[PDB]
Design a protein around this ligand. Structure first.
Ligand SMILES: [Mg+2]
Ligand SMILES: [Zn+2]
Ligand SMILES: [Zn+2]
Lengths: 32, 1242
């Protein structure tokens, strides 16, 4: 199981609220 | 990939918002009213967002799936999946920059605390009611101040010249007018004097304006407001190159551009040191927001928007209903209002309009974006149809119907059914019955797979059709498919952990779920219409989790007291009670005849006895002497007979009942004999002994044999209710009427005038309660043992002596809806039937009870919710952190010269802190033993009156807890596992039996929410001797100290609080600092500050267990202690601070200790409410999900804090495997290779 639409919608909602939320591990940053 | 360790936030910069966006919307249009298609370069636009239909352009040239990653030259739409319409973010380029409402209208204002100005003044700057000064070139002004001062002196000399000129010009005219004139003249003189006075006043006002402009020009600096507007209008044209100012957001952008965070942050660290007092607090409130922007990678430039982002269309959808009418979302109207005013502003910029209309349009735009981001925050909300406020972007996130709350915590699920439950007593515990018509659909793909695997179906579609049609061939396969493929059964409300359980689905014909009778207590599910929800776990990992963790057989023991929850109740209990219970004067009885006959009631085998029973000769409940082989005898009879060899096929004689042998035949081979009537408590201790001694499968099976046998014998028990069977006590006439003679007499005392109505009203209650008691007793003296009513209650199956008393005899006194008892009781059995009045009085308490149990479930649910959301993070992270600290459990206080009643809750299933030293010092047991009864009785035998046990309370582990400190897990019955979410287990364990209370749940939620009690009973501040002076209906308690300080005195406490019983407290006694003074509830805060954390840690447990102990429930302390821990993991800071810490904040203990050392701070212990503790977290997602999403999102966004996802409630929200059970790296990344010795032959 990858990522729920219930996360993506919250991510995109917070991106639409102009809150720059970004995903990254210990070494290397991830992409949406 | 689905692997992101952490989650960082910040503030969206116009650059990043542009980088996000694929196209720019630049027309105020949604969808064409005629054709219902998206409009070009507007909202919902395919070119910028994504295609309406899957692989189809707007114009309709490219509609094939074959090609991808190409833009159509005509329209400009890219041909991909439609799902991108719920992904590809848009943007809007604002002609004038616009600030975010969150960093402005937030309390306190983040921009306001950054730039240091009043929010009422900051409002005026943003909403174009005042100019603000951005950058003053002080040097060039200072260098050329004197020339401008001289110009100002000439400009004063000019208005002075004008002033004297006009006065001179007037005076001569008035003198001339009066001279030509000479009531008629004096009036004209006065008018002239008034006019020249007005001309003087004008010159005075002008000079005042010039001097004011000079003063305000000499006093210039950045972040300075102008109210007049004409002053700035004058200061624009003259002295314009020396400074710069503006009005709106561009001004704040220009202020942020001309800003140095380091110097500002540094100065703030000095201004706090300089002026210690009230202003230090304000400077320190100002410090935190500024200090945050330094370490933050994102710049505070992004606080203002040049471009604003646009949410994916699908989350603000315009879908036509079955007819034509639109049920449009509000966001569309806000975005429309914004893009309209943006287009109009851009058109006003293109035109070259005056400043006023542009500033007004910028105010309108600002208000539109403000309303878009937060509606009904500033002044009035935006409304469309019928005066309802428009759902904003932030309104998606906030509220009970918020994204965080509603649309993330509870969802609908596929591969899942619901149905009505029926009993399935044929089924083994692990089995459950599934309705075949449900099952068929519920496993449709799984059965399709096997139907394509077999040569039943030629292709998938024919298998789908075959299973859809319900053809005869499917049924032979569906069992082959369902064979050991478990299902998760749920019964809402899902209170406790076992409220979900996995089962083997046996196919049944019908439309009902045949549940197991034992698991009904594990669901709290009656068969009174109560539905259950089946879920099919699909993954191998899920299938495993179901099979191992939560398969009903594997978890017999509740995660509460570690008592077997799946034990026999209701019928089974009376069944086994009848089965095993002994009866004198029975059939085939043991006689032991003299001279003539043999002993008769003696049988070679249980087989023989069964044959003697089935044939009319032997009664099951007869004290017969049977010779057994397969069964193990009682512990005393083990020694006296064999004491060397065992009994796999030996022989020994037992003086029992056939039923007790048929019972022991169910219990396991090596389990010894019972020879006793099987009361539900006896069953409880037996299945407990089986649970602690034997494997779990032995318990699962033996309790199932007890179920089957129990039910089989429940029938032939003869437990049936009849008007004959329900009797009345024959003295009920004598005992009741006598209790009239005492009552009526009081009336005869009242009519004369001695006793008052209220004392009479109580004495009546006493008398009729005594009357109720007399009947309550007398019933059992009369009622025979075999009586079904007596069977049902005295087995412990169900029902109480109260219910039997209110069924037969009388209900007694029943309560009013206030709580007060009605003085005239129900003087008649339900068997006799109540009089209309006696019934009508009974209705009150019953409806009150229904109204209370209606309230209880939701309150218990909320308590459960809070207790989960506080201890959501508390897992077993490591095995052992190794700490000597613990808690000292009572365990036999002075004697026998004794066992505590609450050892099982307090001591049992825990690891020992210290080596069990005694008077001699022959340490019988070392630290880290699971504390089985042997240990407890060995420590009682050893001669110690206290034992130190390791607690979560005193666990030195930073993250979660260590396995050893928690103790033996109740679910498993072994040492707790190194990933268990003991937090949620404890939470649910505490939360569930709130429904089984009546003081009660108020006291529980009051104690857990850590509030000031309803009865504020103080504690002793200092230890000393008590002396009490009785004032005018008041207690003056003074405690004379033993140490040598000031005596503790109290004055104004109510007379009906009552003193503690320690005989009773009076003058001439010595009281401890620890103990409570008066009856009621000790304030936790008071106990914490006086007796430290460890005492209040015990006090909470003691005061929150007593309610369960009173209401007949058993929770193990450790569960409470996981909450009482999560409470006391914070400190309130007094002064010093050191690293920008605030006075009267809530900071975590471990991270505070790391700062406290200060190698190159003053914090006190605090006890906070579980809601406050759940609010106080590092993970912004959880805090945002709990309450006040805006407040915490704003506070977090500025801080740019990186969420580690150490907590699991966030991992639920983001949807990654949770850090607990089977999702921790040491479990989820286990590499299992098959052994070379096994792989060799293969
Ligand atoms: Mg029910
Ligand atoms: Zn096209
Ligand atoms: Zn530990």
């Amino acid at each position: 199981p990858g990522i729920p639409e219930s996360f993506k919608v919250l991510l995109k909602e917070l991106q639409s609220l102009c809150l720059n939320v970004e995903v990254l591990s210990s070494d290397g940053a991830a992409i949406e | 990939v689905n692997f992101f360790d952490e989650l960082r936030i910040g503030l969206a910069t116009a650059d990043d918002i542009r980088n996000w966006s694929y196209g720019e919307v630049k027309k105020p249009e949604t969808i064409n009213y005629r054709t219902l298609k998206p409009e070009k370069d507007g909202l919902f636009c395919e070119k910028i967002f994504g295609p309406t239909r899957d692989w189809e352009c707007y114009c309709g040239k490219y509609k094939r799936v074959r090609f991808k990653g190409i833009i159509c030259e005509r329209c400009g739409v890219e041909v991909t999946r439609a799902k991108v319409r719920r992904e590809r973010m848009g943007h809007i380029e604002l002609a004038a920059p616009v600030t975010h409402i969150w960093y402005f209208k937030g309390v306190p204002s983040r921009l306001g605390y950054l730039l240091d100005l009043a929010p009422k003044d900051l409002e005026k700057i943003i909403y174009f009611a005042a100019y603000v000064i951005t950058s003053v070139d002080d040097e060039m002004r200072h260098n050329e101040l004197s020339t401008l001062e001289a110009e100002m002196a000439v400009e004063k000399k000019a208005v002075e010249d004008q002033r004297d000129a006009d006065l001179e010009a007037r005076a001569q005219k008035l003198e001339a007018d009066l001279a030509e004139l000479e009531d008629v003249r004096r009036k004209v003189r006065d008018s002239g004097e008034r006019e020249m006075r007005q001309l003087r006043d004008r010159a005075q006002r002008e000079l005042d304006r010039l001097d004011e402009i000079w003063n305000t020009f000499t006093k210039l600096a950045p972040k300075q407001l102008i109210v007049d507007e004409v002053l700035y209008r004058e200061l624009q044209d003259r002295y314009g190159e020396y400074f710069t100012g503006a009005m709106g957001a561009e001004s704040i952008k220009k202020l942020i551009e001309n800003f140095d965070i380091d110097a500002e942050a540094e100065s703030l660290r000095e201004v706090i040191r300089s002026g210690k007092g009230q202003k230090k607090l304000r400077a320190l409130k100002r410090l935190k927001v500024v200090a945050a922007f330094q370490q933050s990678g994102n710049s505070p430039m992004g606080m203002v928007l040049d471009a604003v982002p646009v949410i994916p269309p699908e989350l603000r959808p315009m879908v036509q209903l079955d007819g034509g009418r639109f049920a449009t979302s509000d966001l569309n109207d806000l975005y429309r209002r914004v893009i309209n005013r943006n287009n109009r502003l851009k058109r006003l910029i293109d035109l070259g309009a005056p400043e006023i209309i542009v500033n007004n349009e910028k105010r309108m735009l600002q208000e539109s974006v403000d309303a878009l981001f937060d509606n009904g925050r500033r002044g009035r909300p935006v409304t469309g149809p019928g005066n309802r406020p428009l759902k904003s972007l932030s309104d998606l996130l906030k509220g009970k119907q918020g994204r965080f709350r509603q649309n993330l915590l509870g969802k609908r699920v596929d591969y899942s059914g619901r149905s009505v439950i029926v009993v399935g007593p044929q089924l083994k515990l692990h089995q459950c019955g599934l309705p075949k018509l449900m099952a068929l659909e519920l496993f449709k793909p799984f059965v399709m797979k096997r139907l394509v695997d077999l040569n039943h179906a030629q292709n998938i579609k024919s298998a789908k059709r075959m299973v859809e049609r319900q053809r005869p061939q499917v049924w032979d396969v569906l069992e082959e498919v369902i064979a050991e493929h478990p299902v998760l059964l749920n019964r809402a409300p899902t209170l406790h952990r076992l409220g979900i359980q996995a089962f083997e689905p046996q196919l049944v014909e019908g439309k009902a779920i045949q549940l197991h009778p034992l698991v009904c207590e594990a669901f709290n599910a009656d068969f009174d219409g109560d539905q259950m929800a089946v879920h099919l776990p699909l993954s191998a990992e899920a299938q495993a989790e179901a099979r191992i963790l939560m398969l009903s057989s594997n978890n017999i023991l509740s995660p509460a007291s570690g008592k077997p929850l799946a034990m026999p109740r209701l019928d089974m209990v009376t069944g086994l009670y009848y089965l095993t219970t002994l009866v004198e004067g029975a059939t085939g009885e043991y006689q032991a005849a003299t001279k003539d006959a043999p002993e008769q009631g003696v049988y070679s085998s249980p087989a023989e006895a069964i044959m003697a029973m089935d044939r009319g000769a032997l009664s099951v409940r007869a004290k017969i002497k049977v010779r057994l082989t397969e069964l193990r005898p009682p512990t005393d009879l083990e020694a006296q007979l064999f004491e060397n060899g065992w009994k796999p096929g030996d022989a020994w004689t037992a003086e029992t009942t056939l039923g007790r042998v048929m019972f022991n035949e169910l219990l396991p081979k090596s389990y010894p004999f019972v020879n006793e009537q099987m009361h539900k408590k006896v069953q409880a201790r037996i299945i407990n002994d089986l649970a602690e001694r034997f494997p779990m499968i032995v318990v699962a099976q033996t309790v199932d044999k007890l179920k089957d046998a129990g039910f089989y014998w429940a029938t032939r028990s003869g437990v049936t209710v009849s008007m004959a069977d329900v009797l009345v006590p024959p003295q009920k006439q004598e005992i009741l009427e006598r209790h009239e003679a005492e009552a009526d007499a009081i009336e005869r005392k009242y009519q004369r005038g001695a006793l008052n109505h209220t004392e009479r009203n109580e004495s009546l209650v006493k008398i009729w309660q005594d009357a109720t008691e007399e009947v309550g007793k007398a019933l059992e003296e009369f009622y025979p043992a075999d009586n079904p009513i007596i069977t049902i209650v005295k087995s412990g199956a169900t029902g109480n002596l109260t219910q039997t008393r209110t069924l037969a005899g009388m209900k007694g006194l029943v309560t009013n809806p206030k709580g007060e008892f009605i003085p005239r009781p129900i003087k008649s059995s339900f068997r006799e039937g109540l009089t209309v009045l006696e019934y009508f009085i009974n209705t009150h308490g019953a409806r009150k009870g229904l109204a209370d149990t209606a309230l209880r479930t939701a309150d218990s649910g909320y308590l459960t919710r809070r207790l989960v959301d506080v201890s959501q993070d508390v897992i077993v992270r490591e095995h052992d952190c190794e700490t000597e600290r613990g808690i000292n459990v009572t365990l036999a206080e002075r004697g026998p010269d004794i066992r505590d009643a609450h050892v099982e809750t307090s001591a049992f299933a825990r690891t020992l802190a210290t080596d069990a030293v005694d008077a001699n010092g022959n340490v019988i047991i070392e630290r880290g033993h699971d504390l089985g009864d042997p240990a407890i009785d060995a420590l009682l035998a050893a001669g110690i009156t206290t034992v130190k046990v390791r607690s979560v309370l005193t666990c030195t582990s930073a993250t979660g807890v260590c396995a050893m400190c928690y103790g033996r897990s109740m679910a498993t019955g072994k040492l707790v596992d190194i990933g268990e979410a003991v937090g949620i287990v404890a939470a649910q364990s505490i939360g569930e039996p709130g429904t089984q209370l009546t003081g009660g749940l108020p006291r529980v939620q009051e104690l857990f929410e850590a509030r000031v009690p309803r009865n504020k009973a103080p504690i002793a501040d200092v230890a000393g001797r008590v002396r009490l002076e009785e004032s005018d209906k008041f207690f003056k308690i003074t405690i004379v100290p033993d140490d040598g300080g000031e005596e503790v005195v109290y004055d104004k406490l109510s007379k009906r609080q009552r003193l503690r019983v320690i005989g009773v407290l009076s003058d001439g006694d010595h009281v401890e600092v620890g103990d409570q003074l008066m009856e009621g509830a000790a304030d936790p805060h008071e106990v914490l500050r006086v007796q430290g954390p460890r005492e209040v840690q015990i006090h909470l447990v003691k005061e929150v267990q007593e309610v369960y102990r009173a209401q007949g429930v058993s929770i193990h302390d450790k569960h409470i202690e996981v909450i009482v821990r999560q409470m006391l993991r914070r400190v309130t800071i007094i002064d010093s601070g050191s690293t920008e810490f605030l006075p009267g904040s809530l900071t975590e203990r471990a991270e505070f200790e790391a700062e406290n050392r200060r190698v190159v701070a003053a914090g006190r212990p605090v006890l906070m409410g579980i809601t406050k503790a759940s609010l106080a977290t590092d993970s912004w997602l959880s805090a945002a999900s709990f309450q006040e999403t805006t407040r915490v999102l704003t506070d977090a966004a500025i801080n740019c804090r990186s969420d580690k996802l150490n907590g699991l409630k966030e991992n639920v929200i983001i949807g990654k495997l949770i850090p607990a059970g089977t999702g921790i790296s040491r479990y989820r990344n286990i590499q299992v290779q098959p052994t070379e010795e096994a792989r060799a032959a293969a």
